[PDB]
Design a protein around this ligand. Structure first.
Ligand SMILES: O=P(O)(O)OC[C@H]1O[C@@](CO)(O[C@H]2O[C@H](CO)[C@@H](O)[C@H](O)[C@H]2O)[C@@H](O)[C@@H]1O
Length: 244
């Protein structure tokens, strides 16, 4: 029932520029009840609360963590979303396949969960191996989705997960219109947000994969901010004339 559903990425988007994070949160603090806020990050919920303590993030209404593999309500984890993502998912098999790749190194255990298998790509490896990985996984019949960001982070999630779907799920839950939604991002794990029908803002300092994506799929609901980090978010709000 609010006029805006603000969905932002953390690293290099909401966070990265303190002065901006501060004047963004200062502005949004004078009309806190006019929007719902959701952080969409690739970080675990624990690693996310940590960030909030370091940079002083403002308390969001929802936390779309681990690339949307987990959604945290004020009350707590969403078990319907979990069951939704658990359906047809075969973590063991997918991992067996992913591990078979030399160019891939498993990320620390604390970066994994029932619906998120992550690795790091060798700096000297050939990025096309990701496309080989994607295809090899796809052909298993298991609804899997490969996410590549920052040229090194590789995430294997269910087709039904990822920041964009997590966002769509939330939209329906809150009964919010795409026209009333704004997504903010900078990397490849943000692509799913822009695949959404919501309004979007790509921070100036965006990563190459996102900018590359934009060139090919960017539409009219996609705004390329002139500013970087939090500044992009304030700019996009003025652009789409949100919070009128
Ligand atoms: O998703 P962001 O909020 O934009 O954070 C990106 C940043 O997070 C780090 C820090 O741990 O890694 C997280 O995100 C990647 C990509 O989704 C995952 O593969 C990784 O497991 C997760 O911890 C960092 O690598 C990213 O730049």
């Amino acid at each position: 029932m609010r006029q805006l559903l603000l969905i932002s990425d953390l690293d290099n988007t909401w966070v990265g520029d303190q002065q901006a994070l501060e004047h963004l949160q200062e502005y949004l603090g004078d009309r806190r009840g006019n929007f719902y806020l959701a952080y969409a990050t690739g970080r675990s919920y624990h690693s996310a609360r940590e960030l909030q303590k370091q940079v002083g993030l403002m308390e969001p209404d929802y936390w779309l963590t681990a690339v949307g593999s987990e959604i945290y309500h004020p009350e707590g984890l969403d078990q319907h979303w979990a069951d939704y993502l658990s359906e047809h998912w075969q973590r063991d098999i997918l991992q067996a396949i992913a591990d078979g790749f030399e160019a891939l190194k498993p990320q620390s255990p604390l970066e994994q969960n029932p619906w998120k298998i992550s690795y790091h790509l060798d700096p000297q490896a050939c990025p096309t191996v990701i496309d080989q990985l994607t295809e090899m996984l796809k052909e298993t019949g298991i609804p899997v989705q490969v996410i590549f960001s920052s040229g090194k982070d590789v995430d294997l999630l269910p087709q039904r997960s990822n920041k964009g779907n997590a966002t769509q799920y939330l939209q329906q839950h809150l009964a919010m219109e795409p026209s009333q939604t704004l997504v903010c991002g900078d990397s490849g794990n943000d692509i799913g947000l822009f695949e959404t029908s919501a309004r979007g803002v790509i921070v100036r300092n965006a990563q190459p994969e996102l900018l590359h994506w934009y060139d090919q799929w960017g539409d009219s609901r996609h705004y390329r901010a002139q500013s970087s980090h939090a500044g992009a978010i304030l700019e996009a709000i003025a652009h789409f004339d949100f919070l009128s």
